[PDB]
Amino acid sequence: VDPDIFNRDPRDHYDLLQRLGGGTEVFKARDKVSGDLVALKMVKMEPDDDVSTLQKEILILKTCRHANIVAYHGSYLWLQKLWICMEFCGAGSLQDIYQVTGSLSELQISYVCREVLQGLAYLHSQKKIHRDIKGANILINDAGEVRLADFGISAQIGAELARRLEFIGTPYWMAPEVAAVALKGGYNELCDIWSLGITAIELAELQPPLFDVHPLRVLFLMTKSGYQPPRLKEKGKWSAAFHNFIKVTLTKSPKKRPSATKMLSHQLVSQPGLNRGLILDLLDKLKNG
Amino acid sequence: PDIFNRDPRDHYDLLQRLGGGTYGEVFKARDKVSGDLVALKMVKMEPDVSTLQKEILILKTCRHANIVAYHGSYLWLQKLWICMEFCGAGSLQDIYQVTGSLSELQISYVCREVLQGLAYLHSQKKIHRDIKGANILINDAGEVRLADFGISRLEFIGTPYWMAPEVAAVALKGGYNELCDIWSLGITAIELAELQPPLFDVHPLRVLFLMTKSGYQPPRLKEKGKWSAAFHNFIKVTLTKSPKKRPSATKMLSHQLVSQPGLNRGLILDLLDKLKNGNS
Numbered sequence: 001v002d003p004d005i006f007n008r009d010p011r012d013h014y015d016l017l018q019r020l021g022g023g024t025e026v027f028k029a030r031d032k033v034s035g036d037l038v039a040l041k042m043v044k045m046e047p048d049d050d051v052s053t054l055q056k057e058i059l060i061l062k063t064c065r066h067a068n069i070v071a072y073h074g075s076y077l078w079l080q081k082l083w084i085c086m087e088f089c090g091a092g093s094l095q096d097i098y099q100v101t102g103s104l105s106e107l108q109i110s111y112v113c114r115e116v117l118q119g120l121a122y123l124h125s126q127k128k129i130h131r132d133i134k135g136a137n138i139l140i141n142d143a144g145e146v147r148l149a150d151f152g153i154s155a156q157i158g159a160e161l162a163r164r165l166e167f168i169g170t171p172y173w174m175a176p177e178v179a180a181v182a183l184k185g186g187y188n189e190l191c192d193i194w195s196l197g198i199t200a201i202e203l204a205e206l207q208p209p210l211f212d213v214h215p216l217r218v219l220f221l222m223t224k225s226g227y228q229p230p231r232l233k234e235k236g237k238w239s240a241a242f243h244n245f246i247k248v249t250l251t252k253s254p255k256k257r258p259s260a261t262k263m264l265s266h267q268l269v270s271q272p273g274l275n276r277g278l279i280l281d282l283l284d285k286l287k288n289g
Numbered sequence: 290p291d292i293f294n295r296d297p298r299d300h301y302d303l304l305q306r307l308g309g310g311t312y313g314e315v316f317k318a319r320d321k322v323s324g325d326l327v328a329l330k331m332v333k334m335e336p337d338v339s340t341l342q343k344e345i346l347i348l349k350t351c352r353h354a355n356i357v358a359y360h361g362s363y364l365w366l367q368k369l370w371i372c373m374e375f376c377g378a379g380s381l382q383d384i385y386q387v388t389g390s391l392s393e394l395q396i397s398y399v400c401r402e403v404l405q406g407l408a409y410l411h412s413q414k415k416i417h418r419d420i421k422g423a424n425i426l427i428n429d430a431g432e433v434r435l436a437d438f439g440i441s442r443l444e445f446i447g448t449p450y451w452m453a454p455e456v457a458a459v460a461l462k463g464g465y466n467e468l469c470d471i472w473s474l475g476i477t478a479i480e481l482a483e484l485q486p487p488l489f490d491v492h493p494l495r496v497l498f499l500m501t502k503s504g505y506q507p508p509r510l511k512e513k514g515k516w517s518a519a520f521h522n523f524i525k526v527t528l529t530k531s532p533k534k535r536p537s538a539t540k541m542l543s544h545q546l547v548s549q550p551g552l553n554r555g556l557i558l559d560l561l562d563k564l565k566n567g568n569s
């Protein structure tokens with residue numbers, strides 16, 4: 001439910017095309033009037049299904065108006081099926097791409113991080129947290145431009161918090177550090193910086209560190225006292241400025257991890273020559289490789 | 290270990306819900322064979338039991354005198370029933386509502402017995418998370434006991450390879466450590482002294498937000514007169530603002546208030562006697 005939801009059938013305005021992506025129901029679609037391409041995320045919805053999560057997710061997306069975040073074109077409601085209409089990105093995600101091209105070049109990774117940091121600075125300026133930064137959620141269009149997508153996990157966290165906030169009851173025995181986690185969450189937007197650092201390793205190595213480890217064992221490894229941030233594996237392949245970018249983004253203490261704005265001044269993402277031309281090259285490798 | 294794949298209604302007669310949602314789905318029940326009374330707590334399951342048996346084994350390997358007795362557990366139609374000791378007198382909140390305010394010596398004994406229970410749970414990397422009068426049980430032997438529901442959300446997690454360490458910490462523990470129990474015990478002592486925690490009449494949200502301000506100062510006992518230096522000091526240190534400075538359960542057990550002589554179950558049997566008089 002949304003206060004600007006179009007109360008009509010999206011198929012009156014769009015021609016459905018193929019289904020997109022694992023980890024979605026997302027469809028490529030074409031505006032019947034304009035022939036423009038879009039992406040339509042359909043989710044069937046009984047009237048008894050709780051709307052809280054879908055309500056927050058639409059809200060999070062409509063109040064975004066930034067180039068590095070997939071544009072929003074309204075939502076629909078018809079026939080017990082909700083639809084979210086957003087910008088379409090012809091090349092899909094960076095994960096879809098590197099599974100074909102192999103590891104990106106350092107300059108390509110540098111451009112991608114700058115564009116992601118720009119989007120994160122905008123999200124964090126709205127006090128939004130993405131919380132699922134990864135190769136699979138960084139979309140690339142035919143022009144080689146970078147857009148951030150998939151606010152599902154961000155919506156889930158916000159939905160449950162507001163619910164845990166009004167199902168609070170008697171917190172009069174609650175310690176101060178617990179109440180801070182109750183109201184604010186236990187972590188802040190700097191988690192997106194860490195995730196970006198992991199994504200940089202992912203685009204260099206085709207998987208995040210510890211990808212071959214059982215996920216539960218990973219949660220325990222990262223919570224141990226002596227846990228050390230991960231590092232690039234093939235050190236000789238990369239410059240010191242890239243290593244430092246990983247080191248600083250992967251600062252273990254969130255009280256010392258630089259913000260998105262600060263990172264956008266780092267040497268790796270402030271060097272000259274970073275433009276979508278680097279990704280047009282990557283996309284040509286994808287086509288002609 | 291014995292988890293029964295049986296309907297617990299085969300063995301017990303349910304009698305009445307206990308508490309008022311403060312405990313959840315908890316029932317007084319009678320053993321159909323003997324007449325023994327027990328308390329049966331129901332907890333819903335998903336189709337997700339391996340770890341379940343591990344936590345059960347720990348619950349019956351326990352014979353700590355400050356943990357409620359565990360008799361068994363039933364699994365039936367995706368619902369887990371935990372069979373426990375039944376305390377006729379209920380909680381300390383059940384008691385002081387009829388009795389009134391506890392005495393400083395009675396409060397000191399409770400704090401000692403609760404601290405021992407807390408030291409046990411913390412030694413298992415369990416956090417109680419809900420220390421308060423309503424959750425401190427008193428059996429007819431005069432024993433002060435805590436319930437161990439540590440046995441009792443991958444949605445938040447999903448895949449963890451990209452998440453920050455602090456996000457993983459929130460996903461596992463929850464953003465804090467067992468020292469939150471020490472704060473809740475300090476508040477509980479005040480509850481036992483005044484029949485309410487500090488700020489009971491303020492709106493939950495308001496109270497929550499006031500604590501996050503850096504201008505927050507811990508609460509204190511209402512009437513400075515009725516209480517001794519030891520009690521006041523016990524409060525001060527248990528209600529330490531920063532968890533990095535809050536004393537552990539083991540350390541708090543050496544505090545003067547819970548070490549003094551004369552702490553014995555007589556204090557609690559006296560309380561039950563007063564309760565018995567109030568109900569006639």
Ligand SMILES: Cc1ccncc1-c1cc(N)c2cnc(NC(=O)[C@H]3C[C@@H]3C#N)cc2c1
Pocket residue numbers: 020021023024026028039041070086087088089090091092093096136137139149150152
């Ligand atoms: C990632 C995600 C997770 C969860 N919900 C939605 C999305 C999501 C959102 C959007 N706005 C998208 C826009 N465009 C694309 N483009 C393609 O998938 C190219 C490969 C197809 C062709 N041809 C995918 C998109 C996926």
Ligand SMILES: Cc1ccncc1-c1cc(N)c2cnc(NC(=O)[C@H]3C[C@@H]3C#N)cc2c1
Pocket residue numbers: 307308311312313315328330357373374375376377378379380383423424425426436
């Ligand atoms: C604390 C807790 C937290 C969450 N879930 C269950 C319990 C719990 C566990 C147990 N083992 C109990 C055993 N006995 C009682 N007794 C009464 O409530 C007497 C006053 C009623 C009458 N008549 C309550 C019990 C509550």
